[PDB]
Design a protein around this ligand. Structure first.
Ligand SMILES: *[C@@H]1O[C@H](CO)[C@@H](O[C@@H]2O[C@H](CO)[C@@H](O)[C@H](O)[C@H]2NC(C)=O)[C@H](O)[C@H]1NC(C)=O
Ligand SMILES: *[C@@H]1O[C@H](CO)[C@@H](O)[C@H](O)[C@H]1NC(C)=O
Ligand SMILES: *[C@@H]1O[C@H](CO)[C@@H](O)[C@H](O)[C@H]1NC(C)=O
Ligand SMILES: *[C@@H]1O[C@H](CO)[C@@H](O)[C@H](O)[C@H]1NC(C)=O
Ligand SMILES: *[C@@H]1O[C@H](CO)[C@@H](O)[C@H](O)[C@H]1NC(C)=O
Lengths: 171, 318, 318, 171, 319, 169
């Protein structure tokens, strides 16, 4: 488990229907929401990777060893019954392990993609923002809509706001 | 002045199991276990034979119910629940092994034995138990040999089938077990009866077991069947005294096919690789909980109604 | 001024295996392989029958060891090592298959064949090999037929049992094989002996055969036991010249039960769902290493002494 | 692997029998120790879930196909020995893998819950503290016993001490 | 002034499968499925017997091809593709179970029955079908009993084998099924023929049966072979008046050994624990795709060419 | 998944051949590449641990005659059972490799992040991250100062005051 999902992030955003992970922004002009494409796709791709493995179908051909419509000899009949039940107990066990293991990792992987997105933003902002502990960065200059798009588009130059941000941080 | 990171949530989550938590809510999930099949037999792409009320054993010996299934070619052979193998009472020794060979087969050919019988023999016997087209008849591939001349000893007789082919041939014969000593003497004479069957790989002897007293007790007239495989180039010989029900043809099983026991109706529009008593299974899922008895290429049966595989993150609503 | 973060540790750690490490030390762990079992058959909540020295086959033909076990109901049937099937020495065709059918049953009901024999037959043959109460006796469910007048030919005889019940019946009989030409003459006459048996689903012929053999329970002569299932509404008939060991009763196997072979005494205050020949296994653990032969609902057998599952973090001591 | 439990934290504390994860503080008025309830319960709840999964196996009823007290036909016996041994090999393998896999996850999970507590404290402290390489936070204002408790309590307000803290760090 | 963290990479990586990705490039990887094997039987460290053209059933009755294999000790027994069981044509009841029993054994000892027959019996019958030194012979461990005086009724005869040993013995006998009524009368007479075999634990009886059959090794006649185990301290008695093919020796199967059916040549310099129809498999790998049918201690067989296990980090080469 | 490999680090260095994880540096004197022994050993040792489990290794006998006919019904039971076993092992074999490979890659990624994190807490207030895996150091740091970062002998407080004056002006 990484920190973010069901973690320092309080809850998910139902409103955001264009992606898995996103940005919500607050400035003098108002409030905006956008979804990060690369990080949600990175998560969707891994899931479909799993789904592809599941429906993998290279299969062995089996023929009948018990008759539906007639009696089979008692001793061999009992052996076939024991064998089939043993094979079934194994597959049932594997199907449960498979999904339990898979689900654990899918939940955790999604958490990691969120943390990675958060980390990527933290490093961009550098000395111009501080984190509030809830997934928000407090920016110590003014960030208009274009500046916000700057952060989501991964083109924010911190040394362009650094001076201002440093003395707003310190005073 | 703030920029906040977060993730999506949904109003209605789906519950899945993990290593650490049963009942874990996640944004989405899909079923890994197929619980629905198709209640038809899907035969598209398959050259198949529906035996209808013909049992596979009946194909070899020519029961009237099997007249249209004496020969064939097929990928797929379908057996139905109350199919008829016999018109005359009796049974086949080693029946399940034989039925499996037919149901593993890709078709059948019939080859005439060429058996010929002396003046003393009547080979044209029929019974009212095997009705064909409203007349007394007999199994098509066999002949009921009796003394042409009632009460008089059936002559000592020899017949040989030679397999001149390059593949093994399956030969079947019958043994008549008479209802009473009175019936046995008429058909075959007072002599002791012996039936000897010898090939290079096989040997056996049979004596009819004469029954007794009423026709309603358990010891009454029956024909019981036996079979063996005759190798290429090998001859099989019958030395017999009366009581042999002799093959006028033997059988050649060709290639391979998939045998299905089911009572679902045939759908030629639909395609499938997995079958069970109650139809087909067309799924991409690795598992199923329809039936533990399936044939062909099949998802593995599991004793669970549902195993949900998360396809989303933890669902955390506000 | 300072604040520090840390985790607990213990003086004594436990070693567990991981994907990347044979020897990994964790704070705590527990067994996942059960190594301990109960030395009793825990039978509380089960309608159970302990056969003692009664062998399951013995129940059907009524060997004296089995007199307490000729009829009954049970969901669990316990077979023991010293178990006796035969008092008059003999063997049974497909004996394991018959024993398995009995050991799967939920009980046995007994039903008269209703067979009666005329003045020529003494049907109360008894022997020292089958003591019942200080006195010579025979199988309870069978009757040893011999000529009332010694040396006289056993009469030609027909007996028919009809299953008028709505479920299948299991009927058994024996073929006597005397140990001398003299013994055979006394019992059945100098005539040729033939015994033939038949229903809609069985026909066979048997011939008593004389032969010198070691004594078992004082006897050089043997009995060969045979059995078949007589379906509802069917009739089974015996035609015999002498040498038939006829059934006085037939068996109905009822419902279903769990068969156990074990050394362990019963404890009826004890509850269990898994059994082996040492007793019972009661455990929440998924695996066990007590035995690869188990019956009932059990953990899977594994070839490991121990498998430790970590229940804590890496242990790093000061 | 997360960086902590066998990593930048030097070792565990045998002294903390109070919980799996905890705080140790040194301040003007002596030193103290307290276990964090949320984090330890997070790890323990996960462990018990694994244990529940392990024992939560409902079962197929098997009957005997090998006579304990009488001989079995040789060829069928050999088929049975082969099958049963094949099934045992599978179960032994599955049992070995489940426990190795499950132990690897358990360890890395507990390490995760540790890192998450540490990160939670760090964000909470904001600019009033700094990290030494080990698990400690060196706090740059006088921190009261009630103040230390405020950090564990998750109640601590960074802004209240920021000026003093920022000054001490720079000077 | 700065310092950078980085990982290595290689120019040519290998692709491996993962849960998320079927085409994941990693710095290095290694095989999990053994694919090659050895086209010889690696018999180093094994005290073995190569039966050659001797079939294992032939060891018990003493067919000529098995003359050098009538007794032995082995931990490994090797059977070859067209090995000979019968000189005088016939078959054995429950033959595959008997073959598996011999092929599990660690050796065979032979014990004489000590059977002796009266003057009206000729026990030395021989045939063109069984040959030694290019001349007529018979199974080494059996005796063909016929009336010394041709066409005469074979005398009623009793023979008993007594197992005075501490281990069970395997006894085999034959029942002769003549080609014709005339042949049967000459050998045994016109009387009805009966053979009964009885021990404390076994009972059976046989009737020789006359029938026309194809020639096998020149004979239309057949011998059906039968067997049973005789327990320690038990006796087995044969009662016969013609058609018995009587045992002159019984077999004791000793210990335990591994049985191999293969046509691969023995290689005495290499050792192995896993075998199949073609040679042997020596690998540390846990899976093999060589063959579904193997014996000994083997990697499990899988329906895959290759499964590569990542032995490196993810590979991210320079653009 | 951890941030570093195929993450905020753009790529690996083919040039580094004495380790999996390493340092690259630039200063007044020049540039250098040094691999890190500990991070590299920890990853490799975990990999050899998997390999040990892998090669850890029941005696079986024949139930299927190579050279003689086998009774048909028992033959079909034997084929069904053997094919059922082979499907299980084939599936197990695929699950093992996939899951183990997923873990191997992420553990490798893990060790890299752990190296990165150790350096960060080490440099403390003297340096700041560029988001591509580098630490811009705001003081004059010669090759010995660099070896001090790799050794774990670096005392941040020695260059702190100077570094902070540079980070604030
Ligand atoms: C099957 O029977 C035929 C004849 O009944 C046997 O074939 C004869 O074989 C001999 C020896 O080669 C030849 O000289 C004859 O020309 C063949 N006759 C015919 C018409 O085929 C054959 O050998 C028998 N097969 C077996 C296995 O006994
Ligand atoms: C050890 O494990 C068992 C079961 O997981 C648990 O009952 C016990 O509390 C653990 N002991 C310790 C030292 O925590
Ligand atoms: C075995 O033969 C010996 C010698 O006749 C005899 O003493 C013994 O009683 C026989 N054993 C049995 C069990 O019949
Ligand atoms: C059984 O016997 C009864 C009475 O004779 C008769 O009604 C019935 O038809 C017989 N059953 C069969 C199947 O022959
Ligand atoms: C790659 O790995 C294999 C096994 O781990 C090893 O034999 C080989 O020496 C390594 N080779 C390289 C570094 O390419």
């Amino acid at each position: 488990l990484f920190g973010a999902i069901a973690g320092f992030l309080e809850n998910g955003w139902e409103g955001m229907v264009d992606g898995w992970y996103g940005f919500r922004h607050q400035n003098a002009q108002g409030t905006g929401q956008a979804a990060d494409y690369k990080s949600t796709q990175a998560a969707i791709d891994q899931i479909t990777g799993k789904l592809n493995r599941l429906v993998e179908k290279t299969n062995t051909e089996f023929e009948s060893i018990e008759s539906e419509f007639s009696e089979i000899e008692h001793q061999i009949g009992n052996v076939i019954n024991w064998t089939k039940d043993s094979i079934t107990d194994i597959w049932t066990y594997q199907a449960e392990l498979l999904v339990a293991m898979e689900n654990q990792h899918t939940i955790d992987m999604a958490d990691s993609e969120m943390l990675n997105l958060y980390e990527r933003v933290r490093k961009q902002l550098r000395q111009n923002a501080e984190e509030d502990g809830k997934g928000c960065f407090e920016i110590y200059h003014a960030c208009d809509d274009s500046c916000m798009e700057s952060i989501r588009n991964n083109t924010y130059d911190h040394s362009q706001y650094r001076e201002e941000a440093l003395l707003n941080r310190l005073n | 002045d703030k920029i906040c990171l977060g993730h999506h949530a949904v109003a209605n989550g789906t519950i899945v199991k993990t290593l650490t938590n049963e009942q874990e809510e996640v944004t989405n999930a899909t079923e890994t276990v197929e619980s629905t099949g198709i209640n038809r037999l899907c035969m598209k792409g398959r050259k198949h034979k529906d035996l209808g009320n013909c049992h596979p054993i009946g194909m070899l010996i020519g029961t009237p119910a099997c007249d249209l299934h004496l020969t064939g070619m097929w990928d797929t052979l379908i057996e139905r629940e109350n199919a008829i193998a016999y018109c005359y009472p009796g049974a086949t020794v080693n029946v399940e092994a034989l039925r499996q060979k037919i149901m593993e087969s890709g078709g059948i050919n019939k080859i005439s034995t060429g058996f010929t019988y002396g003046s003393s023999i009547n080979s044209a016997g029929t019974t009212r138990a095997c009705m064909r087209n409203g007349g007394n008849s007999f199994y098509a591939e066999l002949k009921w040999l009796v003394s042409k001349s009632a009460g008089q000893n059936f002559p000592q007789t020899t017949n040989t089938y030679r397999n001149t082919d390059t593949a093994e041939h399956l030969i079947m014969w019958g043994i008549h077990h008479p209802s009473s000593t009175q019936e046995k003497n008429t058909l075959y004479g007072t002599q002791s009866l012996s039936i000897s069957v010898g090939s290079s790989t096989y040997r056996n002897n049979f004596v009819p077991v004469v029954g007794a007293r009423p026709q309603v007790n358990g010891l009454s007239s029956r024909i019981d069947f036996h079979w063996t495989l005759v190798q290429p180039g090998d001859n099989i010989t019958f030395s017999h005294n009366g009581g042999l029900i002799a093959p006028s043809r033997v059988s050649k099983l060709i290639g391979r096919g998939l045998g299905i026991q089911s009572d679902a109706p045939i759908d030629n529009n639909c395609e499938s690789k997995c079958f069970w008593r109650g139809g087909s299974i067309n799924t991409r899922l690795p598992f199923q909980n329809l039936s533990p008895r399936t044939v062909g290429q099949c998802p593995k049966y599991v004793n669970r109604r549902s195993l949900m595989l998360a396809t989303g993150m933890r669902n955390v609503p506000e």
